[model samples]
Target: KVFGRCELAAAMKRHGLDNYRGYSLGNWVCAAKFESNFNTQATNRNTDGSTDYGILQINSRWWCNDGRTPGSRNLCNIPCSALLSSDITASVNCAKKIVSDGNGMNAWVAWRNRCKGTDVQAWIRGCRL
Candidate 1:
């Protein structure tokens, strides 16, 4: 399902992204916007032939299995299909694990290219969080 920025922000806050592993909620929200435009079902084919899945666009190469895709490390031990859902719990959990593993928001190229060094406060402008 697709969500408005505010709705997505609320859900992220409820899932504890406001301070998850020291990353800011704004950064997460900004990355999600650029990654998937708040559409849970979003996916993209990377130049490497792996696909990015779901809102945060977790990659099939290291995070989840796409079944048809080869070289799936499945680090999250989840099917790529699981990430394509309105319920973002699994995606969020996997993202947390990814960040904890060392990349932080830098794991998302969207974050590096679009959100890095920018003031992300606008991403959460009117949100209560």
Candidate 2:
């Protein structure tokens, strides 16, 4: 499902992403805006023979096991299909794992290219935290 800006904000907070690992709520919201457009079912196939999944776009290469990406680490120990859902539990947890795995949000290219070093606060302007 596609979420409104504030809705996405609320979802992230509910999933306990707020300020996790020095990343603020705004950071998460901003990444989601440009990364997945608040769409839970969103996905992007990468040229590196891998795919990104769900709102935070968990990568098949290291996180979820897609079975298509050869020798997937399945670091998240989850199926790629789990990321493409409104439940968002797997995707959110996978993102946290990625962040805590000595990578931070840098694991996401879009987050680095677009959200890093920006005034991410704009992404959650009127959201009730």
Candidate 3:
């Protein structure tokens, strides 16, 4: 249940770089801030849209090919809770890769702020990469 900061940081680094843009981390934490208030435990069954789920709001059912996360269920299918129970860093990073492999982060962040672009870079200043 405890995600070591080092590992999370590493995942952040990899995902951030892979999803690199001046705005990626800033936007991501922004999304995290708004969606779950940075709480990985935060969840909503009906995010009420096409692409929103879990803490980072992973729309795993729609955009990505996550056979287990959310959406219509099937045999051996993992639920959104399953995805949420898993590593959040990996999940967030996966969300980063989904929207456009990187560009999605920007759009995600934008949506996180309701497209206001408030620029919450201070939260990510300590992050490397």
Candidate 4:
């Protein structure tokens, strides 16, 4: 089934297990829920007339503007729904990929640690978002 959150949560935990072993699964879930309600289809329009897409709510328009399209479809050649579609676990794994890239997630974790229980938005504000 598509958007199977149960499966997604499992996959998310496994993906982060090796790297973020110390990080709590509940913490990850809480952050994701706070970010986008774990909604793979979650999206919003930017003031720049671009679109944010997927569970992570990546700014497809801004990130992939150099590509043929202004969305994730233009960048990864896969549609936004595909990011959240298929199995829920896969979607989590997909986000896992972003972190595994050695860029996005570490920065996020660093920000979290730097802030360390500070106000979520404000903590991430100066650290990294």
The number of the candidate with the highest TM-score is: 2
Q: Residues 45-121, candidate 1, lDDT per residue (tens digit)?
A: 98888999999999998999987667669999999999998899989989988989877788898899999889987
Sorted on TM-score, best first, the list reads 2, 1, 3, 4
lDDT head-to-head 2 vs 3, winner: 2
Model 4 lowest lDDT segment of ten = 120-129
**Model 2: per-residue Cα lDDT at residue 47:** 88
Give the Cα RMSD of candidate 2.
0.9
| lDDT of candidates 1 onward, in order | 0.89, 0.89, 0.50, 0.48
Summing lDDT over every window of 10 consecutive residues in candidate 3, give the lowest-scoring window. Answer: 72-81
Clashes by residue pair, model 3: 53-57, 68-78
Model 2 residue 82 distance off true place after TM-score fit, in angstroms: 0.5
Error of 3 at 3 (Å): 8.8
Residues 47-123 of candidate 3 have per-residue lDDT tens digits of 44333455566554454334445464322233455446546654654564455554555445535445345655554
Comparison by TM-score, 1 against 4, better one: 1
Which residue ranges in model 1 land beyond 4 Å of their true spot?
none
> What TM-score against the true fold does each predicted structure earn?
0.94, 0.95, 0.56, 0.51
lDDT against true structure, model 1: 0.89
Candidates 3 and 4, the one with greater lDDT: 3
